[PDB]
From a paper:
Serine palmitoyltransferase (SPT) is the rate-limiting enzyme in the synthesis of sphingolipids. It catalyzes the transfer of a palmitoyl group to L-serine, yielding 3-ketosphinganine (3-KS). SPT is highly conserved across species and consists of two large catalytic subunits (in yeast: Lcb1 and Lcb2) and interacts with a small regulatory subunit (in yeast: Tsc3). Here, we solved cryo-EM structures of the yeast SPOT complex in both monomeric and dimeric states and the monomeric SPOTS complex.
The lack of the Lcb1-TM1 helix swap, previously observed in human SPT complexes, results in weaker protomer interactions and explains the presence of monomeric complexes. Additionally, we also find one more interrupted N-terminal membrane inserted helix (TM0 with TM0a: T20-Q35 and TM0b: Q40-S49) in front of the TM1 helix in the monomeric species. Preceding the TM1, Lcb1 folds into a short transmembrane helix (TM0b) that spans approximately half of the bilayer (15 Å in length) and leads through a short loop into another helix, that runs parallel to the membrane and is deeply embedded in the upper leaflet (TM0a). The deeply embedded helix Lcb1-TM0a directly interacts with three molecules of ergosterol in a position that would correspond to the upper leaflet of the ER membrane. The direct interaction of the SPT with ergosterol offers a potential explanation for the co-regulation of sterols and sphingolipids in yeast. In all of our structures, TM1-2 of Orm1 acts as a docking station for a 44:0;4 ceramide, which is sandwiched between Orm1 and the amphipathic helix of Lcb2. The ceramide extends out of the cytosol-facing membrane plane through interactions with two aromatic residues, Y110 and Y485, of Lcb2. We propose that the two tyrosine residues function as gatekeepers controlling access to the previously discovered substrate channel. Finally, Orm2 is exclusively regulated through the endosome/Golgi-associated degradation (EGAD) pathway. Together with our interaction studies, this suggests that the monomeric SPOT and SPOTS complexes are the predominant forms in yeast.
Residue numbers in the entry:
A (entry chain D): 3 to 76
B (entry chain A): 39 to 222
C (entry chain C): 7 to 561
D (entry chain B): 19 to 555
Write the structure that this text describes.
């Protein structure tokens, strides 16, 4: 009652702990940057579009934020 | 000549102004059998504020340009919304997905909202928004005679006159501009 | 090499392949017994909502996709028209279909098409084996390379775990291929009826509780060809707005007047009936010939029950007939697996016509109808499928005999009870844990179908892709079948999965949800009235012993 | 003109219904008084924003006439006095009880050439009878290699799939059959369906809608009729195998459409079939192909009884006439239980139609997949049939001798006629229009007009006395044949109240490829004697 034929992919935490990662100066940015690299991406409809259209949409969001922000100072 | 055992023949128009004929017993069952999905989302949650949000974003985006004066920024956002509303509500006839038998294939989305019932809350909201937008624009920014005249003649013949109960199920055919409409 | 490869069968000893298909129980403390709901009304369901901005974002995304979608086709078909010869007229013949009628499948479903249909080889047990493909162009054609990797499944319909390749059921089927053959004689009305068909008809009748039964060969065939036998242009049919397609095809063919009512409202129905009786027939104002009420035993999309105690009372004050469909509840619900008529305590003679199928639980394709005596006699001659269609084969029937007996407790002593408590326990355990972690789930606190809601459109394909790598299979739905705001993923439990697999499932779904920001709960879901966000270890340690109690479940 | 007159009542009656109208209009006046143009434009738009908001819901005009002048006392009286009808009428349930008490049941043996039957709830028992009612014509599913493929598939794949065609259900063995059928019949692809009876009603509505035109045969089977009813499109009819009528009908439709000046041309179809289910004669293909090419029509052929009986090998009607299926026929609907030897059904066509069918067909999207052993067994039979073609030659030889024996006779010329074709494997017999009159006194036209009027009036009871007498007489001939001699034959079983097209009771004899010439010759003589003995007296 303890044998099967499936291989278990280890959980995301487990892989790091085995390889020996327990540090934390620029170590608390790799993960914090990745967290910011999902909030912006997911909520916009980026998966359903095409490459050419997504290229224009990414450029559009960059320029709109830039013009809004630099005009704030000036 | 000979006539068929079962006849479902679409009929064109023979006059400039014509009305979609009332449906028969079989058409009534087809429409009533399945609840529609084009007109259901109007009553759902968060389907009223989204019009206020779109107006605000369009005003801010158009105001972002440096050389645009406040008069022409209001006229632009009034142009974009009135044109956009008219295209979505009163232009595309039928249904996008597959409805049984194509019974909903001669009426627009506005007359498809809430089972042709009139004077419902949703119709009260959608007819009260453009009137407020036109009033605030013309009071907030001073206009001359030419611009005030033009924007009025877009607002009226584009967002209010079609939605009136009188113009319901009415099709206008001009021998050159639009083809012979489908009356049945 | 551009085709789907024909996979070879893996080779192993006997014990190993008896654990791939049906896992054994861990401890005797993982069993729960259902109790009846006699004498208690059904409370109104409670629903949860996410914050405003999520709904606002969903509207913005669909508006953007729709605007972009129409623009692509107009520029294409009008200007570059030599790569779209399959959507334009060619030398006097109209095209097979039009652009508008197919604007959704081509333009909003094509990119997510890799998830929807998957080739598989092997028996669908608690581990399902899948072939591997690599996507080319943008899902235009697929290339297959010849490997197999097992995956845990939550999609296949084996509620009681009869889908086995080595056991009593498969022994009985193999013996039949010797005595009978795999060929059907023809229409049941002239030749092709054997004693095996008669025995199953009697066994189905005793099991469910009515007086007599009939047996067909397709669930779609059973319902589609049934309604025209006793309805005409002078009848009225009142049906719910969330019923299955097989029922609807029978009615539109019949031609009776159809009126529908909002789902879950037991008042608006009464206003509809009092109105329709007085008005009468159209254009003539004459009384209706008969009024029929259709409903469903359990709705798959929502996972909520039908208030049978109310419907039985209403069909008695106004003299209306009643029709009930129990496909997802015949063999796996109730205290002893008989259906909605048992869990609510209503007497079986109140309902007029019953229906069901064999695929979902007992493990074979077919269907049955049960009614009173004189009702069956007239329907046996007025029906068209009996005299024109084909008949069902023997091995499908032989298993259905050797499964309706195990659950009933005749051929096997203690396996039916040991297969109706496990599925009850698993559904109790998964539903409480997901509610405690912070997700939003629908249901009636016992339905095996557990839908989880995802609102943003891009979040659905990402969730599905991410977990096949994590080695788990799921299924999703979209706008053409569900409201614009609400999209969901659907879980199907089984009697084979154990406590450990649920733990293994819970860990992976916890991490995925945290990454995608999926836990958006409120105080209405819990019972105390305050939001909750618990740690994973506390959930796994406490939930298994608290899922048996009832007071913790909201509905 | 005097149009300004009515507008005055409106805007005065509007302001008096409004709780305050004099003040608000006065306030708007004084604030924007510079130019009248402005004050006009805003006094209007806001007010109809007010009046429309203050109005009340109004319902559309429906067919049912409203009764708003009824007090609650009446509505309680009307609802109480209502009296419904029974669910199914038990008035005449005993009259048709003989057709269900005569159904033979086989006891613990496969349906083969020699079986054992009992009738009427174990009351009577007959043993070692000669079967002539089976619907299988080749008997290749009973061989050893087919059985071994079945057992292995059962062990390794279980009994049945547990998922719809959409996701988990389609599997590797399924796709193998689709590739195999397409290669064998020379088509680009194919699609499998759960049941043959639900094939035509599920594919025809997919490609047909309102505004189309369909030209169908004078008499077709029931499933074709159901497909036409669900299509929701104009449907014409032309005489049974009359090319002049088909040409005249197609010429008229084309000329009318050209004169109409319509922007987009609609979809047109031609619906017929191969070996007819009720008549059992053959349809001419070359005329249909030449007519569809000149007049721009699509062709739809529903062959079920000719898949494995026609042609030098068994590829269907296309092989028999020496043509190709890629260009002759657009849509083909077939079945597997009649000849191949297992349940199911398939559709043949090019790639575009199959792709649209995977998503737009109700019976495929919303139903489960076929079991594994059915698919593997058929694939084995296809491989055996392609390897050798001896069974088809023998079946063709017996069918020709059977029809020749009953149609070259002379003493049955005044009682029965043969309405079949020499290539058909089933022989149908009816009664001459003169003999039927002498004992029952009615014709086909009188039956069709009576039933059509009965259906239109929507009466609750449908019962025809002379039609029942003919059915009882035919069943008497079948019973006599079986009691004295060990021969079992069947009669064409129909449900009259579901038919729209004219039809008459008949009697049919089947055949297959595992009999012998000596046995079939003696069965022919015994049936001949049975028909005479009952009729002559
Ligand atoms: C700032 C700059 C500038 C401005 C700008 O941005 C950039 O602004 C940008 C914003 C853009 C608009 C955004 C959104 C729309 C609405 C859309 O709505 C489609 C509505 C679809 C459904 O509608 C029909 O629905 C039914 C089915 O057809 C009809 O009735 C049935 O009745 C019975 C039902 O059973 C049966 O009899 C039949 O089924 C039938 O009769 C009903 O009458 C009719 O309404 C139709 O769409 C198709 O219509 C054509 C025909 O199918 C397509 O093919 C033809 O298109 C051209 C035609 O001349 C030529 O190329 C060729 O002839 C040929 O290819 C065409 O490709 C395509 O549009 C049409 C395009 C438009 C205006 C865009 C244009 C481009 C912009 C102006 C951009 C622009 C660039
Ligand atoms: C002189 C000329 C000057 C040119 C100036 C240029 C002006 C640009 C005008 C752009 C107009 C674009 C309008 C596109 C609308 C086309 C929609 C056709 C789709 C047909 C589908 C029929 C049924 C599906 C309906 C449905 O389910 N809809 C829903 C989605 O599922 C529905 O989409 C969502 O709930 C959101 C509703 C938001 C409502 C806000 C409308 C405000 C106006 C927006 C215009 C934007 C203009 C951008 C430049
Ligand atoms: C430049 C365009 C936008 C102008 C000319 C459009 C005006 C249209 C919409 C107006 C002008 C006259 C109006 C009109 C004329 C006559 C009648 C007949 C009457 O029994 C009901 C109202 C009805 C049907 C209305 C409908 C709307 C019409 C046709
Ligand atoms: C900006 C445009 C759209 C404005 C001016 C036009 C509106 C139309 C619809 C209005 C203006 C005058 C109205 C009008 C004039 C006169 C009459 C005759 C009266 O016995 C009944 C109402 C009736 C028939 C209405 C119908 C609707 C009309 C024609
Ligand atoms: C008055 C001018 C400035 C116009 C442009 C302003 C507002 C419009 C929308 C208003 C003003 C008067 C209104 C009006 C006048 C008279 C009638 C006839 C009545 O039987 C139905 C309503 C109807 C058809 C409405 C329709 C909407 C109208 C025409
Ligand atoms: C599953 C479904 C069917 C499908 O019947 P099958 O025999 O599985 O093809 C019929 N009825 C209901 C209610 C269903 O959910």
């Amino acid at each position: 009652q303890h044998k099967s034929s499936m291989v278990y992919i280890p959980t995301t935490k487990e892989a790091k702990r085995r390889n020996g990662k327990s540090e934390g100066i620029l170590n608390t940015i790799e993960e914090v940057v990745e967290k910011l690299y999902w909030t912006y991406y997911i909520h916009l409809p980026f998966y359903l579009m095409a490459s050419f259209d997504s290229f224009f949409l990414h450029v559009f969001f960059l320029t709109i934020f830039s013009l809004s922000f630099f005009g704030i100072l000036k | 000549t000979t006539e068929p055992v079962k006849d479902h023949r679409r009929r064109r128009a023979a006059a400039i102004i014509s009305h979609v004929e009332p449906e028969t017993f079989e058409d009534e069952n087809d429409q009533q059998l399945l609840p529609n999905m084009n007109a259901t989302w109007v009553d759902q949650r968060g389907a009223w504020i989204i019009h206020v949000v779109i107006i605000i974003l369009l005003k801010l985006f158009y105001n972002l340009f440096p050389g645009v004066t406040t008069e022409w920024s209001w006229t632009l956002t009034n142009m974009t919304y009135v044109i956009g509303s008219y295209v979505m509500f009163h232009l595309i006839k039928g249904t996008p997905f597959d409805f049984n038998g194509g019974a909903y294939d001669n009426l627009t989305m506005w007359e498809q909202i809430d089972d042709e019932t009139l004077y419902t809350p949703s119709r009260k909201f959608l007819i009260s928004v453009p009137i407020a937008l036109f009033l605030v624009s013309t009071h907030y920014a001073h206009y001359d005679l030419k611009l005030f005249s033009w924007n009025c003649f877009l607002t009226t013949f584009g967002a209010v006159v079609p939605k009136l109960p009188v113009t319901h199920r009415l099709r206008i055919s001009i021998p050159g501009i639009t083809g012979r409409a489908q009356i049945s | 090499y551009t085709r789907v490869p024909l996979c070879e069968p893996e080779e192993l000893p006997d014990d190993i392949q008896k654990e791939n298909e049906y896992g054994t129980l861990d401890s005797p403390g993982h069993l729960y017994q259902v109790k009846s709901r006699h004498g208690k009304p059904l409370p109104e369901p409670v629903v949860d909502t996410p914050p405003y901005y999520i709904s606002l974002l969903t509207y913005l995304n669909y508006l953007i996709l729709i605007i972009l979608g129409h623009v692509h086709d107009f520029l294409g078909m009008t200007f570059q028209k030599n790569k779209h010869l399959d959507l334009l007229e060619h030398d006097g013949l109209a095209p097979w279909f039009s652009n508008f009628e197919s604007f959704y499948v081509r333009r909003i479903k094509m990119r997510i098409d890799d998830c929807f249909s998957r080739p598989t080889t092997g028996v669908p047990g608690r581990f399902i084996r899948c072939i591997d493909r690599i996507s080319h162009n943008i899902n235009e054609y697929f290339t297959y390379s010849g490997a197999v990797y097992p995956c845990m499944n939550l999609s296949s319909y084996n509620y009681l775990g009869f889908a086995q390749s080595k056991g009593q059921c498969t022994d009985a089927a193999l013996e039949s291929v010797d005595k009978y053959s795999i060929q059907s004689g023809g229409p049941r009305a002239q030749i092709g009826t054997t004693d095996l068909h008669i025995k199953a008809e009697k066994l189905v009748a005793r099991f469910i509780g009515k007086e007599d039964a009939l047996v067909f060969s397709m669930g779609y065939g059973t319902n589609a060809n049934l309604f025209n036998a006793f309805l005409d242009k002078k009848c009225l049919v009142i049906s719910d707005e969330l019923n299955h397609t097989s029922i609807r095809t029978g009615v539109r063919l019949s031609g009776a007047a159809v009126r529908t009512f909002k789902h879950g409202d037991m008042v608006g129905l009464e206003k509809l009936i009092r109105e329709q009786i007085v008005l009468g027939q159209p254009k003539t104002n004459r009384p209706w010939k008969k009024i029929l009420i259709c409903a469903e035993g359990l709705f798959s999309m929502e996972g909520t029950l039908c208030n049978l105690p109310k419907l039985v009372e209403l069909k008695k004050k106004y003299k209306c007939y009643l029709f009930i469909d129990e496909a997802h509840s015949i063999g796996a619900m109730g205290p002893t697996g008989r259906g909605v008529c048992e869990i609510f305590g209503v007497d079986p003679k109140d309902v007029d016509i019953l229906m069901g199928t064999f695929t979902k639980s007992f493990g074979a394709a077919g269907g049955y109808i049960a009614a009173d005596q004189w009702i069956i006699d007239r329907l046996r001659l007025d029906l068209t499928t009996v005299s024109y269609s084909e008949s069902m084969p023997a091995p499908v029937l032989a298993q259905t005999i050797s499964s309706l007996q195990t659950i009933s407790g005749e051929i096997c002593p203690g396996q039916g009870t040991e297969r109706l408590q496990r599925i009850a326990f698993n559904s109790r355990y998964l539903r409480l844990a997901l509610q405690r972690l912070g997700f939003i789930v629908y249901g009636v606190a016992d339905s095996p179908v557990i839908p989880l809601l995802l609102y943003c459109p891009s979040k659905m394909p990402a969730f599905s892709r991410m977990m096949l790598q994590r080695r788990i299979a799921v299924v999703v739905v979209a706008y053409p079948a569900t409201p614009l705001i609400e999209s969901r993923v659907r879980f199907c439990m089984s009697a084979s999965l154990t406590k450990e697999d649920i733990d293994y499932l819970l860990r992976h779904v916890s991490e995925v949800g945290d990454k995608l920001n999926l836990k958006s709960n409120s105080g209405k879901s819990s019972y105390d009235g305050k939001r909750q966000r618990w740690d994973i270890e506390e959930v796994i340690r406490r939930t298994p012993e608290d899922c048996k109690d009832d007071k913790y479940f909201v509905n | 003109v005097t149009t300004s007159s009515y507008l005055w009542y409106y805007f005065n009656l509007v302001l008096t219904q409004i709780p305050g109208g004099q003040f608000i209009v006065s306030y708007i006046k004084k604030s924007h008084h510079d130019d009248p143009y402005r004050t006009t434009v805003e006094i209007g738009l806001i007010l109809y924003g007010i009046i429309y908001y203050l109005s009340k819901p109004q319902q559309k005009k429906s067919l049912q006439a409203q009764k708003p002048n009824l007090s609650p006392q009446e509505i309680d009286a009307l609802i109480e006095d209502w009296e419904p009808e029974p669910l199914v009428d038990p008035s005449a349930t005993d009259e048709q009880s003989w057709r269900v008490a005569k159904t033979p049941v086989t006891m613990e043996m496969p349906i083969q050439n020699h079986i054992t039957i009992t009738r009427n709830n174990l009351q009577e028992k007959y043993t070692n009878v000669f079967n002539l009612a089976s619907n299988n014509f080749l008997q290749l599913s009973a061989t050893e290699p087919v059985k071994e493929v079945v057992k292995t598939t059962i062990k390794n794949y279980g009994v049945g799939a547990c998922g719809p065609a959409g996701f988990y259900g389609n599997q590797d063995v399924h796709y193998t059959l689709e590739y195999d059928l397409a290669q064998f019949f020379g088509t680009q692809g194919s699609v499998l369906y759960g049941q043959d009876f639900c094939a035509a009603p599920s594919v025809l509505p997919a490609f047909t809608k309102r505004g189309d035109v369909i030209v169908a045969d004078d008499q077709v089977s029931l499933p074709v009729q159901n497909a036409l009813q669900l299509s929701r499109s104009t449907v014409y009819y032309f005489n049974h195998n009359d090319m002049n009528s088909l040409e005249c009908l197609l010429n008229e439709l084309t000329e009318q459409e050209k004169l109409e000046k319509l922007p987009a041309i609609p979809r047109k179809f031609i619906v017929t079939e191969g070996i007819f289910h009720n008549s059992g004669d053959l349809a001419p293909l070359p005329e249909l192909t030449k007519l569809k090419n000149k007049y721009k029509f699509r062709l739809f052929v529903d062959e079920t009884f000719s898949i494995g009986v026609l042609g030098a090998t068994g590829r269907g009607l296309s092989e028999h006439f020496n043509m190709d299926r890629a260009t002759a026929i657009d849509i083909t609907v077939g079945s597997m239980a009649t000849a191949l030897g297992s349940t199911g059904g398939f559709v043949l066509g090019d790639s575009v139609m199959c792709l649209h069918q995977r998503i737009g067909s109700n019976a495929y999207c919303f139903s489960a997949c076929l079991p594994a052993y059915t698919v593997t067994s058929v694939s084995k039979v296809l491989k055996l049939m392609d390897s050798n073609n001896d069974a088809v030659q023998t079946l063709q030889k017996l069918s020709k001798s059977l029809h020749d024996s009953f149609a070259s006779d002379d003493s049955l010329r005044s009682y029965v006629i043969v309405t079949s074709s020499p290539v058909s494997a089933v022989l149908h017999l009816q009664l001459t229009p003169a003999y039927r009159s002498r004992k029952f006194g009615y014709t086909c036209e009188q039956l069709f007009e009576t039933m059509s009027a009965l259906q239109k009036k929507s009466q609750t009871n449908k019962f025809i006395e002379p039609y029942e007498e003919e059915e009882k007489f035919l069943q008497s001939i079948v019973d006599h044949a079986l009691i004295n001699y060990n021969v079992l034959i069947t009669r064409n079983t129909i449900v009259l109240k579901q038919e729209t097209l004219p039809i008459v009771p008949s009697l049919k004899i089947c055949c297959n490829a595992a009999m012998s010439p000596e046995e079939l010759k003696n069965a022919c003589e015994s049936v001949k004697q049975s028909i005479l003995a009952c009729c002559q007296e």
